[PDB]
Curated annotation (Swiss-Prot), chains A, B, C, D:
Catalytic reaction(s) noted: (6R)-10-formyltetrahydrofolate + NADP(+) + H2O = (6S)-5,6,7,8-tetrahydrofolate + CO2 + NADPH + H(+)
Originating gene: Aldh1l1
Residues recorded as bearing N6-succinyllysine in the entry: K256, K363
Subunit-level organization: Homotetramer.
Swiss-Prot/TrEMBL keywords: Acetylation, Cytoplasm, NADP, One-carbon metabolism, Oxidoreductase, Phosphopantetheine, Phosphoprotein
Family: In the N-terminal section; belongs to the GART family.
Superkingdom classification of source: Eukaryota
Region (Aldehyde dehydrogenase domain): 13-498
GO molecular function: aldehyde dehydrogenase (NAD+) activity; aldehyde dehydrogenase (NADP+) activity; aldehyde dehydrogenase [NAD(P)+] activity; formyltetrahydrofolate dehydrogenase activity; protein-containing complex binding
UniProt-recorded name of the protein: Cytosolic 10-formyltetrahydrofolate dehydrogenase
Length: 498, 498, 498, 498
């Protein structure tokens, strides 16, 4: 039997695992060490969670290696790996209310959105990839013939083997799902590190894999310190790939560590400063609605949020009046209250960073139109904010808030290429967008924008079939889509002579 | 007008550029510095070659950058880019004897082999990749629809931008062309660092890009020091991809610097210790021919040369006897002479290295059945060598020689799984092969071998359409085939709502 | 409520629909016309079944058209259409014991096989294709830019629309599943025509689509005379694709009909005379079992069965001696009994042709080693048959039997192209096989065989991922695999200038 | 030596073969039968051309079948096949002035346009398809494993064999180039039947294949009666694929014949009546330019000609007036005059049909704004024509004219779905267009149009990489694009057990 932290909320009896998941069992960390996970709604401790040690990482991994090399996962039909992954998806759906509640407690996700998206997309993610398992194909290739002889050349797609994935705290389960589904669809086994601040949906997902019959060893979760577990996953000789989403500096270190050990393959999503250009000839109310969302969605803790809105001169003031009208209507509150629109930031230290951030924006000269402060109520809520008169040299033009702060700039009537470089000046390139009703503009603007995603007349419109990843200092590699699969596959060439 | 080093050799008149190619002109390095390049057939100094300085690397990068962003190459149709690359290939052909002659002098490549393979394949590459330009396609993806609205999602494959590629010395022009043709075809610009010890066909090549009409600044070439130029390209914040083939420790470092600067994408080809497994049921005469070749091809300076031969008990002795018989017959000598089937080694330091290498095999217990020493003639020639009684723990069973040293162990009659396991006991994984007439062992062994390429009843049969790359510590990324392009393209997702 | 035929048998209580399925409701045919369906184990009348007339064909088409054009199926996400098909597969799984049993009474399929294979594969078929729904992608293409402007070119894969599929009687549910599942996955709607002699499992399937939530009109089934429904569907101006499996004469007329109406798309799969070539170096006992199965599986009623076995002189006599011993251990009997392994032929008329066929086999000079006659018992059973001494010019060497008739020819030891030649001297070309331990023989033999599928050391090894169709007069077009989707999709090219 | 018709014209001495081209040699038809080919600039006989008889067809097929089965074309590497086809484009380039004059003579194509587009695009198509040869690739597929044994499934893509292709007269060289290039690229051989009224460029083409090194018998050409040649090819037992482009009645008959003989494969491109919908928010003047071209290009002799312009009510009259302004500026005359805009129709009988068509438009109530007549001068000119007040039931609203006839209908402001019905109420569906500055209608009208090509803010912008073909009664199959290659290839699934 599994030890749970029981807790009655949202009409529910939650049963939450709080330990390391290694080898298909929940165990305490070495020397029973633990740490506190914190509910951002009121500041309380939710419980104590195991704190992984170097020798626990070694066990997660030995188990991942054994499951891959000798266990069932590596011996069964691609189609059957499909079945299992599609079953895990049914289980996740059977437990959806419970997972969205846990994600609301653990991470401050407004409960309606945690159902429809955090958990909703998690489920689509496994179901999509399960589809791929028996549809991953190699090639036969018509090479030159060694006459008087004959040659056949074919390629076999194979799994890379044991993989370490490190997940961010903005959407704990969904991001777990994005990287894990693809990784396992390709026939790998995995050691997962959820962020230190958000371990709970990972741990419950762990248990679901048991409920789903996924073979002992295939999934191993290690909550705890990022630089203890992330570091060792990178150095380890039996790990062949690291998937990393997170901060830039930590990214660089990770790739560096991958290089120094065994030249493991590495993915990196290091956030962004995504531009959104809004011309005069767009549909303005809709630009307001979608503009607001491009910033405020999931309390701005969103690696592709619009980090700079460039609004055409002649509609700028009208756009700002309208955004202010609508911001006053958002309902800030507890994530479990059904009428809540805008919930807490994820943890305390981020709320501090948000405060410091808008302090500095005011200092350096920008115009603060609303918000900027902690909301006066318990927990870690932050007021939806709007800056105008942002000039390209300001820190709030260069830096990623990861919070609900709308940073607006003007550009001149009909002045396309100039606004284009302003928008391209960054060393990020994770996403971008443009609103206009003119087709020429839209097409042209999407060619020139130096970002991995261009949204046209919509925003935050990701999908499990559509690949996701940045250019430049946002990193490289994709999550979601056929393309995702390639990070977790290796290609073998086989050339016969006969 | 271009300065040349003129030489009457091989019934032609080589006219060799010897300088830096930067932005369309041959120029001297900073401070007019130069180094000598040496002819391995006689020990003499072919000529003086510019020695590239940090400020030159930067000038080469700035010109690659201008050409990508504001040059014609970035404006022209994909079809016309293809045209230009087919032209280049025609020019290369028109100069085939000169290029193979240059390569004979600079690298010691036997002229016939050079003409057929080094240059032949080179020309095939540019031809192959030429036809890819206007067939590089993206996708349209049926995403869930934001009803009542509609969504179109598509992808654009786009060039990554300024690239830097670092070429080894074993097939100077060929290796250059494997990497450049793919890079160029995807629409990038390039800065190429050929090995210090082999700069010559790379500068001739550069002159040819001029004959071909490749716009100024698309190709730039920088002979010089490996660390000086490699390190600078790795750090430069305008470079976005490194392609690298070379030694383990250098590669790791390259990958490190890529991480610590701007998360530039990277590729690593790091050689191997490739196992070749020979079963008593193969055609034995053919196995001696192909087996010998698997080692001695291009005097062993070959990244997928067979590092270890495992030969079945029942035929081990008859197999050795026959190899020895056939080695006696090889004419070693001047690469320019028609009779010659074995050139000198590339350079002096690699020859001394092969000498230490075989002493070391003897000290540790392996039988030295022939060769082992420098051939007593001018230049840097090495004896085709054969070792037997080689135990799994020996240094020469683990380390990559890069020379003509066939290294043979036995295995037990019947013992399939056992041998696979010893063949897989390396942290290399570049290539492998199996000889046998049995369909069942061939398919099974090819599954179980842990390497990027598996040759079945042939060896060294690469082709411009078949992807080439390692697993484990041989690195990652592919040269050749369609897969090679994915290394030099990026995917932008455009998602419209309407 | 639905009118059933109830039947207690095999320890279940069968509930079998028996009417036209049209617009999601079972209805009687024009003027209440009916015909009888005969149990082949005993010749009795299972029941009356509706007899579709012309006005019914139009009603079914008119329903499919409305459901494609205005109903949910043409409006939902590709992703969700996936879910409906995975759901249909789970419903078929839930009624699996019952479907196997209807297939036993209706088609004389041995129960244990009907369950593992007819039903089994049918489930995989819907699971596999449900997978494709949202992995069906078009392209983005790099056309020449109309300077000084820009062009964008993409392709959208769209459904074809209303399809008619005509299903054979050999594996009724399975072959329905084959063509239906791909058709639906691509977003089409369908009118299905099962074989006059095997309507039952189709009609029960029609009911299960109700349980799965498939919108009304998407599936429609019309039992009846093949030549009336078949005729009308292929004439109808609102049907845009016929998928057909059946005989040459009928297939031909159908294609002719598609042309004279509205130039509908067609696929044709017209049977086979598949050569199996058995080499002396093969594993003789496996060769015998796989040989047995190659002819006897599903009492030979199988478009891909080995209709000639060529055996190498040195092992011919020993092969026949063994085949005969095995033929003799075959238990013949009621498909419902656990220990039966050779059930009755599908229907009387077919049984009669099998009789006529061996009459001519004997008349024309072939040695009849065993069987070749109706088993004396009731219903329609036929005796496992083996002919040896078959000469190329003979009727039984040219015409497909589609019964359990093994037809053997010698070929001279070591004569490969000569037998290849004989194996290819047919206007069929649907499948083939070679048994041999020689990789070289195996690979060469598979190049040279003029056939849609080549098996190597196995036979009847179809898989839902592996495309299935013939060359020459056996047809064109694939079932199964990614290739299947192509027969049911159109490609639209969109070219913008901007 | 070949027999020429020598003509000094357009500063050149043309050398025009006039014989049948069978097996690499030009020859008279059976009993030397000939027919004349008429210059439509002045109605003069150009010269007499051989007239293919049945025996002749058979000879050509046999020469193709021999070349495919046993000749060089069949044994070479796909890469070497690529090369020859590239050489073929080069020879055509060197002859490009000559071919364009020949086409100006035989087809009345304006010389400037024959050079740039008729011949230019031909040159492109060969170049395009040459690149595809060594890049046509099969699959390796993850099927379920027959445990404890193992399985390998792969697909080989192979040629179909002898093809027959029937070429229309409107762009004789170009159309021939379209089908022949992909056909040859895929590995097959061919009998090409040019239009009876336009043999000359096809025959000049055949000479060129000689110069190019195409093996004797890969390309066979048979000028003469359409019924005689095309009908024989369709029934021939040794032909395996027909590619047909022309008229609906002849197309239907062709498909029928493929069915009746051996179920050979068939493509049909059967013309269009393609709608071009112009919205009031377009650029008015670009619309009048692109609009005029959409109809008048190549004298209206164009399968994707805009057969109806639907102009939004509010901009109609301004549009019709501007169009009249511009039609009066078009210069009419000799195809060799370098300032000609509009040349003669292709032949008398078509001129005569243009005349009748226009009478009929007026008779049924449409408004003749200009033209609708033979231009009085020698040869077969027809006036550029504008019709207005066209209504949905009229004959000229339904029938394809294939002449230079603008047929305009108004449509009510701010309806969109209602103009789509009108644009879709034809049984043609080859092409279509939308002019609009508004992205939302553009993307939506592109989905909704039932045609194989949608131009958006441009027209007639085909391209060798972009697939061309029809839906509904326009036929099926593609020319141009990767997807054309699959009309000419078959797939072999090969399945191992081991």
């Amino acid at each position: 039997v599994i030890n749970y932290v029981e807790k009655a909320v949202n009409k529910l009896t939650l049963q939450m695992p709080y330990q390391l998941f290694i080898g298909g069992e929940f165990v305490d960390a070495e020397g029973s060490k633990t740490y506190n996970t914190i509910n951002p709604t009121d500041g309380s401790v939710i419980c104590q969670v195991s704190l992984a040690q170097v020798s626990d990482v070694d066990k997660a991994v030995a188990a991942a290696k054994e499951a891959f090399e000798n266990g069932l996962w590596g011996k069964i039909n691609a189609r059957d790996r499909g079945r299992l992954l599609y079953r895990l998806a049914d289980v996740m759906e059977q437990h959806q209310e419970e997972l969205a509640t846990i994600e609301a407690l653990d991470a401050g996700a407004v409960y309606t959105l945690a159902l429809k998206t955090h958990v909703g997309m998690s489920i689509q993610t496994f179901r999509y990839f399960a589809g791929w398992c028996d549809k991953i194909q190699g090639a036969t290739i018509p090479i030159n013939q060694a006459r008087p002889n004959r040659n056949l050349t074919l390629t076999k797609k194979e799994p890379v083997g044991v993989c370490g994935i490190v997940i961010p705290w903005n959407y704990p389960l969904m991001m777990l799902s994005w990287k894990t589904a693809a990784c396992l669809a390709a026939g790998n086994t995995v050691v997962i590190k959820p962020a230190q601040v958000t371990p709970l949906t990972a741990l419950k997902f762990a248990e679901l894999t048991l409920k789903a019959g996924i073979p002992k060893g295939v999934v191993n979760i290690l909550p705890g310190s990022g630089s203890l577990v992330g570091q060792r996953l990178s150095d380890h000789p039996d790990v062949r790939k690291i998937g990393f989403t997170g901060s830039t500096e930590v990214g660089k270190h990770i790739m560096k560590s991958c290089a120094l050990s065994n030249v493991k393959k590495v993915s990196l999503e290091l956030g962004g400063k995504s531009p959104l250009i809004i011309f005069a000839d767009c549909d303005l109310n809709k630009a307001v609605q979608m503009g607001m969302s491009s910033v405020f969605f999931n309390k701005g803790e969103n690696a592709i949020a619009a980090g700079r809105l460039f609004v055409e001169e002649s509609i700028h003031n009208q756009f700002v009046q309208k955004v202010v009208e609508e911001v006053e209507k958002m309902k800030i509150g507890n994530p479990l209250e059904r009428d809540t629109n805008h919930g807490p930031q994820n943890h305390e230290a981020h709320l501090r960073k948000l405060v410091e951030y808008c302090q500095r924006g005011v200092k350096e000269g920008a115009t603060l139109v609303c918000g900027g402060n902690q909301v006066p109520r318990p927990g870690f809520f932050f007021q939806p904010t709007v800056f105008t008169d942002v000039e390209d040299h300001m820190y709030i033009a260069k830096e990623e808030s990861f919070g609900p702060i709308m940073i607006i700039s003007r550009f001149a009537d009909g002045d396309v290429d100039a606004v284009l470089s302003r928008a391209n000046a960054t060393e990020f390139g994770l996403a971008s967008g443009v609103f206009t009703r003119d087709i020429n503009k839209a097409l042209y603007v999407s060619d020139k924008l130096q970002a991995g995603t261009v949204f046209i007349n919509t925003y935050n419109k990701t999908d499990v079939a559509a690949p996701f990843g940045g250019f430049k200092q946002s990193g490289f590699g994709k999550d979601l889509g056929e393309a995702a699969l390639n990070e977790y596959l290796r290609i073998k060439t086989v050339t016969f002579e006969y």
